[PDB]
C-alpha cells in the first residue's frame, strides 16, 4: 500500500534500449510507486545528485555565503566546456560543475561533511574515501527510495539547517517551469564506480499536489544521458501528472 | 541611463498594438525602451501589485508561507480558477484579486503606505480603498519605476525581510528552462482608462539579468496574451531568448 509495484513503466526503458527505475512519490496520497522495487532500494553512488547535500551545507556554513557569489575558474582546463568558466551556485548546479563542489568539498571538511550529513539521514552516511570525491568513487550510497525521502524533507524544510539554505538549494534545483508544472531537480552520472548509472532526483510541482521521483538507470555510455530526463517524462506523462 | 530603440515598435505596430517594453541590462547597467515618454508614463499597477502586495504580507506575517491556504470565500467570481482554494503560489499565478483583497484589508491602510514609501513604489499614493486601490485608486507606477522595483526585490534589497522577498521571487515564477528562467506578474488594469495590459519582471541568464517592463493598450481581452508575446518578441530581437 504504501509502495506499488507499477511494472508498465518498464515499457519505457525497454523502448529506450535502457534499464533503470523510476521511483514516483504522490504527496498528498502517501503513496509510491515504482516500476522496480527492488531496484527502487538498490543504494548507489549519489554522483553529482549529491551536489544537494553537498550545496545545503555548504549555505549552511557560510562556506557559500549566496547563489550569486561567483566561484572562479581554477584556469583548468577540463572537459566539459561550461565547466572552464566562473560559476554562481545557480550555474554551478546547471551545469554540474564539479571542480566548485569539489571546493565546497574540502571547505567543509571530512569532521563537518559527516556530522551534518548524518543530520540529513542520507543514505549509508558513509563518506569514506576523498573528501572531495567520495560521491563519486567513495563509500557513500544511496538508494532512488532514499533520495525521495531526503527530498520531501528539502521539500518541507525538514531538514536540520535553515531554511533559507533550503530555499537556495530549491533554487538552484529549478530546471523547468510552465503553466502546467515546476521541477526542481538534480542529475547524476556514476561512472568511476560500476554499475555505471544515471540519476534524476526531484519532484514536480503541481498546483495542488507534488510529485517526488527518483530515477536511475544504467548508463554504460553517456550516450544514453538525456534519456534520464525523458524516461521520467514519459512515466510523468502516462501518469497524467504532466500534459 | 535610457536608450530609444524604435526598431520594437514593428513588435507592437504588426500586433496591431500600442504600448511600451522597457529593459534593463542589469550587468550594464542599460536600460532599452521602444518609447522614452510612455517608458516613464505612470499608471495604475493592477495586478502587478500582488508583488509588493505579497512581499508586505510575507513581510507582516498576514501570510506565514506560501503554502498557507487561503479558503475561497464562497463567492463564485467570473475568472473560474478563482474559485478554488488557494496559496500564495497558485494565488499568484492566477492573479486571484479576492485572497489579495483580502491581504491588502489585513496589512491595512497605515502599513501599506508606509511600506510602499519605503519600497519608493510609483507614486506612493494608496488613495482609495484599502482593497482595491492599485485597480481603481490613486497610486501609479510607469515601466520604468516597476524596473527599479524589481531590481530591488531580485537584490533583497528591498526593506522586508529576505525571507519574504525569497518567497515572492518564487511565486513569480513563470517559466524556466535550459535557456532562461523568468520571474514576472501580469497586469490587466480594467476599471480606469486608459485600459491597459502589464508584465513585469526579469529573465534570469547564467551570466545576466535582464528586468523587463512592459504596458500596452488593452481595449479588449483579445490581446492579453500579446503582454507576453511582444515581450518576447522584443526579447528575441535582442537575442536574449532564443
Ligand atoms: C555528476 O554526476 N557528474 C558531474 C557532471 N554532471 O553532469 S550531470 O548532472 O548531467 O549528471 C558530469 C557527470 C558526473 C561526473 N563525471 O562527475
Ligand atoms: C489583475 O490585473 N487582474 C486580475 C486578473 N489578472 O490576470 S492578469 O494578470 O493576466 O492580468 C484579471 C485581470 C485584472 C482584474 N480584472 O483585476
Redesign the pocket.
Known amino acids: 500500500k504504501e509502495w506499488q509495484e507499477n511494472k508498465s513503466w518498464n515499457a519505457h526503458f525497454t523502448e529506450h534500449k535502457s534499464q533503470g527505475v523510476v521511483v514516483l512519490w504522490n504527496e498528498n496520497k502517501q503513496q509510491g510507486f515504482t516500476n522496480n522495487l527492488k531496484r527502487a532500494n538498490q543504494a548507489f553512488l549519489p ?5 544537494i547535500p553537498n550545496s545545503l551545507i555548504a549555505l549552511d556554513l557560510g562556506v557559500v555565503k549566496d547563489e550569486h557569489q561567483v566561484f572562479k575558474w581554477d584556469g583548468q582546463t577540463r572537459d ?1 566546456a561550461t565547466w572552464n568558466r566562473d560559476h554562481n551556485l545557480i550555474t554551478a548546479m546547471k ?4 571542480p566548485v563542489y569539489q571546493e565546497f568539498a574540502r571547505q567543509i571538511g571530512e569532521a563537518r561533511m559527516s556530522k551534518m550529513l548524518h543530520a540529513f539521514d542520507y543514505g549509508n552516511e558513509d563518506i569514506s574515501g576523498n573528501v572531495d570525491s567520495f560521491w ?1 568513487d567513495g563509500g557513500i550510497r544511496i538508494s532512488a527510495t532514499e533520495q525521495i525521502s531526503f527530498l520531501r524533507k528539502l521539500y518541507h524544510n525538514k531538514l536540520h539547517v535553515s531554511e533559507r539554505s533550503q530555499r537556495i538549494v530549491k533554487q538552484a534545483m529549478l530546471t523547468e517551469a510552465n503553466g502546467d508544472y515546476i521541477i526542481r531537480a ?7 564506480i560500476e554499475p555505471k548509472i ?2 534524476w532526483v526531484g519532484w514536480v510541482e503541481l498546483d495542488d499536489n507534488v510529485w517526488f521521483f527518483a530515477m536511475n538507470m544504467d548508463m554504460p555510455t553517456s550516450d544514453g ?1 538525456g534519456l ?1 530526463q525523458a524516461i521520467t517524462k514519459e512515466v510523468l506523462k502516462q501518469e497524467k501528472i504532466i500534459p
Open positions: 554522483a553529482s545528485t549529491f551536489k566539459i551545469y554540474s560543475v564539479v563519486l538534480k542529475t547524476g552520472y556514476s561512472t568511476r544515471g540519476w544521458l534520464r
